[PDB]
């Protein structure tokens, strides 16, 4: 039943007694459900150390991975270039998932096309799909550039992207001069951040590899910045803002912030902003290139060092306090531009907030997951805050990354109780937060199911989720936030301390039981 002035959505509607009786009858008569005592016993078992041992012994089954596949990262990289259409050579189901995935995180239109390879292309190849798809995409959406990646189907059948695109231009389906950079992005290798790295390297080598003769390092007086797979708009904005503050000429290659934040003013903009082809062409002329996320940009770093002859600095992700200092000083050294007093004031304000909030964050235990560079930066900032990241997880990191993380934790007294897990999913994380409970989780929206599980064991066992990372689906406009620089550190610091304070208020709201310590002032 529905009251016209109290219309209930699904959650309060099905908690009505008539729906409760229906569901109980359905469960008891037809569902053949396991008895609730057995269900409770099994759930209690899944929270124990014995279950965790079996959980971590598995080698074939992945449960709730914290990673995506390569072409998703390639699409995001392609979206960072001016009037560029992401084009995934392969099956159309992948593109529908890529677009939907980015739709739900950014709440924005996501432009990406497939050439709809089917069972016929499984035996004959996707050459005809490439010729028709490139011609149709150019004719319909009129991009200045088509960036081609691959689905796993095209990779498994061994389609030659270079030959297919060359044959498309020779047979007149697209002009010979039309830029069609390509990258093989196999989804059974690496993760989405690997696809971003491959796509950027493909675009960079498309525009510069055969034109290195007239290039001179430092002739345009700029600094290239490669962000990598980045889903926070504020991270693109904070880097540009800091470079403008230092009066440092820069080129942000793969800049998607404009197209991922178009205004709603009565018009739809398929394209907005993005790195121009002239910017990519002139990139070898820069003084240097900075990898914002060096752990996911190894193929790009190898290409830039070997082809552009840029001495890419060994810079960490500019996260927290120390690494933002190192990034700013490295930018200052390369460009010769002094760090302005405004940035020193911003750093001092971040230090002031660190001082103001240190009592509520010291000793706080965190389990975190995400992409390798974000996780490393988050761990570094947590150590700077006196927090203990006790469960550091990265589904898509290698052993070299784990070695660097262990060195970072060894440098800090607050990393002594820390364990780094690589190649582990969020079902592994669920075991970790049950057996060695942190105060909070830092991760994407998939951690909400871990919080539900820990709450089900008990309120005193619930581990609240702090939503930092990708993807964020159950909150709105968090993609506008910043995690890089002093501004990003301030936003992270404010989120962390107020998560502690909000959790403490929830624990102390109980009248006459915990309402002492329900302090007005914290």
């Amino acid at each position: 039943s529905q009251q016209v002035d109290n219309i209930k959505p699904s959650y309060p509607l099905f908690r009505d007694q008539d729906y409760k009786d229906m569901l109980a009858k359905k469960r008891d008569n037809f569902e053949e459900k396991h008895p609730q005592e057995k269900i409770d016993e099994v759930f209690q078992w899944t929270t124990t150390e014995e279950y965790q041992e079996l959980n971590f012994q598995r080698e074939a089954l992945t449960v709730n991975p914290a990673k995506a596949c390569q072409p998703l990262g390639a699409v995001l990289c392609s979206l960072g270039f001016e009037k560029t259409m992401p084009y995934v050579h392969g099956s159309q189901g992948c593109v529908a998932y890529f677009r939907t995935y980015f739709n739900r995180h950014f709440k924005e239109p996501i432009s990406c096309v497939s050439d709809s390879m089917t069972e016929d292309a499984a035996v004959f190849g996707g050459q005809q799909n490439m010729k028709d798809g490139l011609q149709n995409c150019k004719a319909i959406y009129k991009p200045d550039m088509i960036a081609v990646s691959t689905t796993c189907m095209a990779e498994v059948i061994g389609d030659d992207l270079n030959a297919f695109i060359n044959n498309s231009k020779k047979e007149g389906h697209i002009p010979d001069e039309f830029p069609v950079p390509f990258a093989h992005t196999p989804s059974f290798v690496g993760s989405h951040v690997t696809g971003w790295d491959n796509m950027f390297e493909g675009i960079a080598r498309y525009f510069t590899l055969n034109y290195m003769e007239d290039k001179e390092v430092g002739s345009n007086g700029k600094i290239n910045i490669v962000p990598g797979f980045e889903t926070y708009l504020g991270n693109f904005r904070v880097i540009k803002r800091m470079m403008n503050e230092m009066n440092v000429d820069y080129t942000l290659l793969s800049d998607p912030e404009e197209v991922l934040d178009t205004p709603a003013d009565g018009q739809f903009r398929m394209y907005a902003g993005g790195t121009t082809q002239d910017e990519m062409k002139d990139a070898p002329n820069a003084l240097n290139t900075l990898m914002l996320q060096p752990w996911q940009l190894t193929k790009t770093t190898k290409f830039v060092k070997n082809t552009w002859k840029h001495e890419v600095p060994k810079l960490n992700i500019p996260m927290g306090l120390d690494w933002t200092d190192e990034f700013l000083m490295k930018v200052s050294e390369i460009s010769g531009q002094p760090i302005p007093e405004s940035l020193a004031k911003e750093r001092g304000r971040l230090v002031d907030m660190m001082t103001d909030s240190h009592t509520w964050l010291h000793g706080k235990k965190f389990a975190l997951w995400g992409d390798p560079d974000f996780v490393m930066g988050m761990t570094k900032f947590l150590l700077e805050l006196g927090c203990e990241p006790i469960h550091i997880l990265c589904n898509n990191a290698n052993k070299r990354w784990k070695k660097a993380m262990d060195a970072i934790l060894a440098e800090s007294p607050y990393g002594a109780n820390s364990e780094v897990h690589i190649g582990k999913d969020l079902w592994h994380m669920r075991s970790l937060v049950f057996t060695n409970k942190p105060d909070f989780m830092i991760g994407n929206s998939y951690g909400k199911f871990i919080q539900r599980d820990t709450l089900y064991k008990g309120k005193e066992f619930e581990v609240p989720l702090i939503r930092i990372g990708f993807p964020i689906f159950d909150r709105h406009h968090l993609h506008r936030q910043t995690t890089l620089g002093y501004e990003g550190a301030m936003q992270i610091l404010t989120t962390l301390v107020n998560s502690v304070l909000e959790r403490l208020d929830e624990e102390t709201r109980g009248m006459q039981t915990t309402d002492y310590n329900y302090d007005l002032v914290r």
Binding site: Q2, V4, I7, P9, S10, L13, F14, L23, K26, F30, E32, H34, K38, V42, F43, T46, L54, N55, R58, A60, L61, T62, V63, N64, P65, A68, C69, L72, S91, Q92, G93, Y97, T100, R104, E108, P109, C112, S114, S116, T118, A122, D132, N136, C137, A139, I140, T151, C152, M153, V156, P186, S187, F188, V189, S191, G266, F268, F449, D453, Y456
Partner: protein, 475 residues
């Protein structure tokens, strides 16, 4: 109307000659007097390469749509990590259970294929994975292996692994060859998933008559409980005196599917996804199946009376009791919200059922559907749409991103109902948008209780203040 054909001609000029000639078959004005939609529109064909098609794949239609909602079963996304990750908890097929213990819908079980699995096969990895599932999730009541694209390309044999492991563990393991390249859309995923149900689950209790049966046993087929849609439909059916033995597949169990061959009537809500299993059950067990529509009071009342006519007079008497009981509720909803929605025009683009099933609910609020289309509807889907849509009204099969935008720019609807991939395109243009797949995370919309939510949601979005503020006052 020549004007609609002129619009179709104008949007067609952008395409190259080969792409254009293909697309004219998929756009046509609606002719209610026409009996066969093959003579006006063409469907279920291949998507043109290089266009922003909205369609998914066979894996999305099998794992995402049919098998995934089965709560007491673990569904393995067999292959690389991508497909299972993007489809994890994305459909809102509601269920009741303890996730990770006896229910696994919002979970992402995957084999996470690497290069070694692509090069040397993943049959051994699949066998090991099933063992790990048995150890770590012992309360699962069954396993489905949803093949992703590489599975059918590297020559893996998941039927042999499923057979051996099912005998070894005493479990039902359903191999589904739903590789995303197999068809042209999610539609073939429905057929592959339905055949997997028939070949591996449906005949489990053929020689088992222990389940007690009544003359009023029904099974809901093709309702995936989107936001509790099947629960809102089930309460009406059981208030009518019927016993809903099974529902496919939202909130469904493997045992419910095995009990379906014992019902008296199969109520099919989504014909497109589950007409395969309904025809098989009619030919094998003799169970009649009928299509029903619980969208809006007018369709719900008609379907309830049509269902009750399949049983004795006691059920028909209870049907009039249910209709009378809910009559004040939906009449109050109409009285409240029809004045705010009367005369508004809607353009719809959903998958294989909702482009035509929701039209009556809109007409119950005084609204008019000035255009509709299917991502993967067949010719029989468009046959059903012809009489449910007004004359000289736009129909678009497998509409591209460009075509749908151009149609909206000309038709200028007051509301658009479509998927998440076009939600934010038309919000930039200032047209109110309602998601017709996820119900914009609202719902349910089925039954009488769902109609109140539907009218509230249409009113909330269509008459929202935000739409009058898109133009800057100084511009």
């Amino acid at each position: 109307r020549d004007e609609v054909e002129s619009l179709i001609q104008e949007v067609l000029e952008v395409y190259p000659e080969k792409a254009k000639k293909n697309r004219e078959k998929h756009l046509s004005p609606n002719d209610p007097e026409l009996e066969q939609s093959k003579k006006c529109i063409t469907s279920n064909k291949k998507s043109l390469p290089g266009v922003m098609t909205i369609r998914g794949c066979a894996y999305a239609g099998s794992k995402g749509v049919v098998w995934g909602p089965i709560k007491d079963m673990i569904h393995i996304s067999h292959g690389p990590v991508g497909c299972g990750q993007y489809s994890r908890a994305g459909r809102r097929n509601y269920y009741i259970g303890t996730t990770g213990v006896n229910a696994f819908v919002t979970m992402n079980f995957t084999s996470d294929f690497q290069e070694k699995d692509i090069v040397f096969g993943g049959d051994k990895k699949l066998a090991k994975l099933i063992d790990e599932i048995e150890t770590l999730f012992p309360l699962n009541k069954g396993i489905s292996v949803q093949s992703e694209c590489p599975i059918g390309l590297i020559g893996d044999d998941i039927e042999a692994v499923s057979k051996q492991k099912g005998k070894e563990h005493g479990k039902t393991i359903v191999p589904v060859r739903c590789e995303g390249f197999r068809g042209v859309s999610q539609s073939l995923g429905h057929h592959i998933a339905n055949d997997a149900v028939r070949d591996w689950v449906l005949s489990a209790r053929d020689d088992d008559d222990s389940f007690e049966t009544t003359d009023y046993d029904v099974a809901i087929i093709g309702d995936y409980n989107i936001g509790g849609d099947a629960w809102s439909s089930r309460i009406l059916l059981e208030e009518m005196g019927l016993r809903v033995v099974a529902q496919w597949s939202g909130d469904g169990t493997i045992s419910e599917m095995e009990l379906t061959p014992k019902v008296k009537l199969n109520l099919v809500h989504c014909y497109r996804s589950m007409n395969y299993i309904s025809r098989h059950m009619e030919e094998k067990y003799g169970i009649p199946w009928m299509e029903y529509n619980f969208f809006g009071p007018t369709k719900t009342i008609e379907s309830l009376r049509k269902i009750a006519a399949q049983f004795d007079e006691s059920i028909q008497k209870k049907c009039e009791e249910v209709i009378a009981k809910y009559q004040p509720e939906w009449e109050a909803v109409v009285a409240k919200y029809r004045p705010r929605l009367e005369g508004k025009r809607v353009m719809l683009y959903v998958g294989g059922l909702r482009p035509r099933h929701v039209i009556g609910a809109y007409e119950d609020l005084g609204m008019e559907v000035v255009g509709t289309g299917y991502e993967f509807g067949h010719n029989d889907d468009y046959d059903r749409t012809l009489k449910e849509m007004g004359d000289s009204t736009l129909l678009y099969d497998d509409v591209t991103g460009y075509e749908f935008e151009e149609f909206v720019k000309k038709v200028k609807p007051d509301l658009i109902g479509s998927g998440i991939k076009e939600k934010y395109i038309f919000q930039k243009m200032g047209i109110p948008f309602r998601q017709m797949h996820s119900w914009d995370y609202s719902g349910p919309y089925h039954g009488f209780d769902g109609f109140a939510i539907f009218a509230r949601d249409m009113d909330m979005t269509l008459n929202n203040p935000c739409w009058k503020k898109l133009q800057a006052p100084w511009k």
